[PDB]
Design a binder for these strands. Structure first.
Length: 40
RNA sequence: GAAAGCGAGUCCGAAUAGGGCGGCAUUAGUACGUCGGGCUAGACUCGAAACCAGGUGAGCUAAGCAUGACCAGGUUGAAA
């Protein structure tokens, strides 16, 4: 499974479909506008 | 990090001393070839005494069984 981690920020509206993501990575994808999609 | 897991952070711990990690000023890997060296094979070549398996031998010799052969000549003089 896939994982999104907070490494390189530049800010952009993006929608990510990772199996799980780190607190900070969500608070960076949304913080620049966007969504982090995870299943049930 | 023992691991759940968490993640440029993570583990001890009830928070603050520290381990390993990223940033580090940071350079990058991968496929193949020739070469050094490693490991695993008999592993640089030649040599044991010995250990185990299967089988060959009693035409030698050690014995047993069966059936044959053999012992000039002389001395002594037991029982009955």
């Amino acid at each position: 499974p896939v994982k999104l981690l907070a490494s390189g920020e530049i800010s952009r509206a993006v929608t990510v479909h990772v199996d799980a993501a780190s607190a900070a990575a969500i608070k960076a994808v949304e913080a620049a506008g966007g969504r982090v999609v995870l299943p049930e």
